[PDB]
Structure 1
Amino acid sequence: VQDALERALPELQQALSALKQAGGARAVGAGLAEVFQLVEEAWLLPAVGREVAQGLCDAIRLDGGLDLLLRLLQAPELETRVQAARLLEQILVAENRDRVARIGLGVILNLAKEREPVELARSVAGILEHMFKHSEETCQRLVAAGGLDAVLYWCRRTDPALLRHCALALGNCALHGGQAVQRRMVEKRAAEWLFPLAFSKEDELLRLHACLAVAVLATNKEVEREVERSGTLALVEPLVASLDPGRFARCLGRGPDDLQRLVPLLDSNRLEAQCIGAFYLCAEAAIKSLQGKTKVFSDIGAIQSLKRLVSYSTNGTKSALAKRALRLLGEEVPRPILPSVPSWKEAEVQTWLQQIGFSKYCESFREQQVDGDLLLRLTEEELQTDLGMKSGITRKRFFRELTELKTFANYSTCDRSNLADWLGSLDPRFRQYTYGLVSCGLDRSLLHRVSEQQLLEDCGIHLGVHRARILTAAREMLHS
């Protein structure tokens, strides 16, 4: 456990002293091959070699070997360049990236232009893959310079190991880039270069990481139009329907900082991003449930998002993956709600409260006898006085859940002229006011004679922007 470090430290001390001593061509590459072979032997220990490899990379950093690699990447030869590059590919851990981001940027960026041999490119793609995981500043310095161009040119190749590093580099750049980095990637059409990486029938991990990069680019609202025009979203949904997370749980762990990146994939109301997030959180929930670290999903809060995915599902694949992810954890799976909300009695409202996280007020609704018709017509004052929900923040969380409910609702028992589809064609956040306008006796043939006070007092539209938009639309297109 600790004696492997005692075996591997003085050997790397002698090897780095030999690398400092040698200044030729073949001896330097032989020393780099010896260091790289010792690092490869350090990778392959069962549940031991992780901390051992981290300690050996820290010892290489403290011996000044990182600056030695930065000087050997400036060497005018070709062989010792690819051995130093393949060694620097495996040395890069969570503590070396700061020292490489301070100094080493510009040297690796220079090798990003030299693209013709495969032995350079397969490792420089992995070095850029590691360097996109540092911060947003390093992502800006790589994308604004010729670092993104290297990956977008190397997506053309057929190397099954290089394209994995390219897909992971684009995914980690989309995760840790920001706004302008994603704008510069999609204006340079980085989502279109992921089409051979999401369709290649030789590797499936490569297609999964390509679909991850496509989904993370598709979680930005100013980006989704050109991603839908690219056509790489349509390969996401069958592929996730074709694979199994229990097989890919061994190849795919990550820390909690990367576990925080998979949660807004589910709360970004896109089908492909929710499928990718459900598949990855199911596989990594199998990972964290094999061990005893299931508190991380409750700390970050993906469990309530998976419950929302189960209770608000229109797709069988993401619902099955969310049910499997909640089954691999230590809580019960919820049931899909009945969409006919005006047809709800009391027990459906109680089940809805038990599923969305309002259990404490369950006995607050049973004594008051609230069904779906009273749930669709509930205001501030009845929550505050009659229901014992005195906190306005708790009331606002209840109105957010009521927005999520009245978006996903079947109004077939009350809507005469299909008003919900018109409200959705205006803006998909307007359908929550459908019950506001159907219960007042309105249809498509009357909205040209409705004022603002009738939308405020009777229909209950509290936002004046939405009132102005509904009045303008009802006077411009429903006047005939």
Structure 2
Amino acid sequence: VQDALERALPELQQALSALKQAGGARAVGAGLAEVFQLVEEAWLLPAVGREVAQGLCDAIRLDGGLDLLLRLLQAPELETRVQAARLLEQILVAENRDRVARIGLGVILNLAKEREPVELARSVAGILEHMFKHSEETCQRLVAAGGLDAVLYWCRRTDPALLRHCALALGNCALHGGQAVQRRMVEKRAAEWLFPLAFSKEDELLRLHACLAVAVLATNKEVEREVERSGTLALVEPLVASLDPGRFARCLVDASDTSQGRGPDDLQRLVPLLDSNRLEAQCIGAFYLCAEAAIKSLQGKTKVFSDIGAIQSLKRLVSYSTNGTKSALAKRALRLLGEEVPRPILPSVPSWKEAEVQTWLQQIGFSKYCESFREQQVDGDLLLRLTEEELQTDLGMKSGITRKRFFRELTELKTFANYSTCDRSNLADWLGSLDPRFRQYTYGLVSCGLDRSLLHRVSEQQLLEDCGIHLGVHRARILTAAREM
């Protein structure tokens, strides 16, 4: 499908040569308009626009296109600025992204001080958004000085494209930025400014991006207080519930902000939102994943999600979902990828009987051992207290790899199980507060009769032997937490 490359690269080289030869303002503007048209038609090329646009961006990278665009962007006249920034925001691929991070930092901030031209402001917002898509060190250095002031000022504006770009930029800050970056942004009242934007009924896209940024901020368990004080959290769920993934898929074809799909890096960033223990974050992540799933199915690719690994997260959500809209979104996405829909699994693992054990074993595809469990009368308690030796000898799992897979499944089930039948001190809640996966040990401690009050007097040997916590790091963390009452 390189015919388009042979169609565009000669014209692109000619246009780049003209742009380098363009010393006059009119010639600069004409060349910038031509290259902008070329990159736009490359982007909108049906079902193949992404890779051809990336190739055009690479061809711009050679011949020093980036420095030429920066040079034209430093010109006194605003026409050069607007045209150059319009071109640049379309071509800010990861390679050009890091090149700008290395070289062009500081001029972009200075021209971002030019908040008055809204037409320029939209393009500058796109530039800084794509910069936020870059690594975290760039996030601190840019967001600290040029980020919050410019993004908040343009959020206070009313133009739709600028607000949409600002919301996307804030979402990228929340995703690629560190917990310190999110903390600083939250302290900068960013959520409070986003609250009208998410409450702005005009555009669904702006509200969606604002909800995404709010959810990613809520993933930080240190600033969530003022985050929920913003009130957007109670707004996130009704919005995602009201919207239709199929409707969103049919739309955005005309408004091609994401019509050509979304970068695998962006989806990889989104995936952690599923296992975030925050219902709004999981809702918005599921909605985005379902929308991108529909878009890719229209394009005809589903392997990218498996490469990212969202399949496992979605299936775990389906098996361990209590909400209705989360279940609907996950099932719809899985059916969009042409994947099986697992039946929800009964959470009362401690009270499980043989039927539940057989069902769960068949669900993890371990039928070869099912009868043995049925032979051994395995129930919830025994399954929860199952050990390596018992699995190997009594149940005949003589291959270590199979035992490792079984213990991985058991770890997942333990982490996402409800122990309300047995515990009474909410030891599971405390362990999850320390770390989600720590919940895997909860029943063991319950099997030991340990209590929160008694936790400060437990020992390492008691943890390893009685509680069966094989990992030394987890034992050390638990002991350190328990020593502090």
Shift of 1:197: 2.9
Say which of 379, 385, 399 aligns to 1:377.
385
3-state DSSP of counterpart to 2:437: coil
| Structure-2 separation of matches of 1:233 and 1:301 | 27
Shift of 1:458: 7.6
3-state DSSP of counterpart to 2:452: coil
Shift of 1:115: 1.1
Change in 2 beyond 3 A, CA 1:399/1:225: farther
Q: Please say if residues 43 and 49 of structure 1, whose CA atoms lie closer than 8 Å, have aligned partners that are also in contact.
A: yes
3-state DSSP of counterpart to 2:301: coil
Shift of 1:126: 0.4
Change in 2 beyond 3 A, CA 1:131/1:312: same
Change in 2 beyond 3 A, CA 1:88/1:338: closer
Change in 2 beyond 3 A, CA 1:356/1:158: farther
Shift of 1:60: 3.3
Deviations 1:153-188 (A, max 9, x none): 222111111111111112222222234333332333
Shift of 1:349: 1.1
3-state DSSP of counterpart to 1:146: helix
TM-score (norm 2): 0.80
Shift of 1:212: 2.0
Change in 2 beyond 3 A, CA 1:390/1:116: farther
3-state DSSP of counterpart to 1:163: helix
| Structure-2 separation of matches of 1:372 and 1:188 | 49
Q: Which moved more, 1:432-441 or 1:15-24?
A: 432-441
Change in 2 beyond 3 A, CA 1:246/1:461: same
Q: Please say if residues 140 and 181 of structure 2, whose CA atoms lie closer than 8 Å, have aligned partners that are also in contact.
A: yes
Q: Are 2:414 and 1:406 equivalent residues in the alignment?
A: yes
Deviations 1:322-372 (A, max 9, x none): 112222233321112233435432121122233356555434422212122
Q: Please say if residues 307 and 355 of structure 1, whose CA atoms lie closer than 8 Å, have aligned partners that are also in contact.
A: no
Shift of 1:123: 0.5
Q: Which moved more, 1:367-376 or 1:288-297?
A: 288-297
Change in 2 beyond 3 A, CA 1:136/1:468: closer
Shift of 1:10: 4.8
3-state DSSP of counterpart to 1:197: helix
Shift of 1:400: 6.1
Partner of 2:449: 441
3-state DSSP of counterpart to 2:193: coil
3-state DSSP of counterpart to 1:414: coil
3-state DSSP of counterpart to 2:273: coil
| Structure-1 separation of matches of 2:199 and 2:103 | 38
Change in 2 beyond 3 A, CA 1:351/1:290: farther
Deviations 1:58-84 (A, max 9, x none): 333333332222112111222222222
Change in 2 beyond 3 A, CA 1:50/1:251: farther
Change in 2 beyond 3 A, CA 1:295/1:80: closer
| Structure-2 separation of matches of 1:135 and 1:476 | 36
Partner of 1:99: 99
Say which of 319, 332, 338 aligns to 2:340.
332
Q: Which moved more, 1:180-189 or 1:415-424?
A: 415-424
Shift of 1:305: 1.9
Q: Please say if residues 73 and 81 of structure 1, whose CA atoms lie closer than 8 Å, have aligned partners that are also in contact.
A: yes
Q: Which moved more, 1:401-410 or 1:62-71?
A: 401-410
Q: Which moved more, 1:413-422 or 1:302-311?
A: 413-422
Q: Which moved more, 1:269-278 or 1:297-306?
A: 297-306
Shift of 1:242: 1.1
Q: Which moved more, 1:142-151 or 1:117-126?
A: 142-151
Partner of 1:232: 232
Deviations 1:356-396 (A, max 9, x none): 56555434422212122433443454334322346778767
Q: Please say if residues 18 and 31 of structure 2, whose CA atoms lie closer than 8 Å, have aligned partners that are also in contact.
A: yes
| Structure-2 separation of matches of 1:232 and 1:343 | 39
Q: Please say if residues 155 and 163 of structure 1, whose CA atoms lie closer than 8 Å, have aligned partners that are also in contact.
A: yes
Q: Please say if residues 311 and 355 of structure 1, whose CA atoms lie closer than 8 Å, have aligned partners that are also in contact.
A: no
Instruction: Return the index of the structure with the highest Cα Rg.
Output: 1
| Structure-2 separation of matches of 1:247 and 1:403 | 38
3-state DSSP of counterpart to 1:335: coil
Change in 2 beyond 3 A, CA 1:405/1:160: same
3-state DSSP of counterpart to 1:460: coil
Q: Which moved more, 1:46-55 or 1:70-79?
A: 46-55
Shift of 1:113: 1.8
Shift of 1:459: 7.6
| Structure-2 separation of matches of 1:422 and 1:83 | 56
Shift of 1:279: 1.7
* Paired residues for 1:135-284 under 5 Å: 135-249=135-249, 253-284=261-292
Change in 2 beyond 3 A, CA 1:357/1:260: farther
Unaligned stretches of 5+ residues in structure 2: 253-260
Change in 2 beyond 3 A, CA 1:308/1:42: closer
Deviations 1:87-112 (A, max 9, x none): 22223234322332232222112112
Deviations 1:422-458 (A, max 9, x none): 9989998887777668778999999999999999988
Q: Please say if residues 148 and 188 of structure 2, whose CA atoms lie closer than 8 Å, have aligned partners that are also in contact.
A: no
Q: Please say if residues 47 and 299 of structure 2, whose CA atoms lie closer than 8 Å, have aligned partners that are also in contact.
A: no
Change in 2 beyond 3 A, CA 1:474/1:88: closer
3-state DSSP of counterpart to 1:105: coil
Change in 2 beyond 3 A, CA 1:293/1:55: closer
Q: Please say if residues 112 and 147 of structure 1, whose CA atoms lie closer than 8 Å, have aligned partners that are also in contact.
A: no
| Structure-2 separation of matches of 1:461 and 1:3 | 60
Q: Please say if residues 191 and 214 of structure 2, whose CA atoms lie closer than 8 Å, have aligned partners that are also in contact.
A: yes
Partner of 1:18: 18
Q: Please say if residues 33 and 83 of structure 1, whose CA atoms lie closer than 8 Å, have aligned partners that are also in contact.
A: yes
Q: How many residue pairs are counted as aligned between the two chains?
A: 477
Deviations 1:126-162 (A, max 9, x none): 0111222232232233123323431232221111111
| Structure-2 separation of matches of 1:38 and 1:470 | 59
Change in 2 beyond 3 A, CA 1:415/1:167: closer
Deviations 1:214-254 (A, max 9, x none): 22233334443443333322222111111122232366712
Unaligned stretches of 5+ residues in structure 1: none
Deviations 1:242-291 (A, max 9, x none): 11222323667123333322322222222122212222222222333345
Q: Please say if residues 216 and 273 of structure 2, whose CA atoms lie closer than 8 Å, have aligned partners that are also in contact.
A: yes
| Structure-2 separation of matches of 1:89 and 1:474 | 51
Q: Please say if residues 15 and 34 of structure 1, whose CA atoms lie closer than 8 Å, have aligned partners that are also in contact.
A: yes
3-state DSSP of counterpart to 1:134: coil
Change in 2 beyond 3 A, CA 1:379/1:244: same
Change in 2 beyond 3 A, CA 1:82/1:257: closer
Change in 2 beyond 3 A, CA 1:137/1:246: same
Shift of 1:309: 0.9
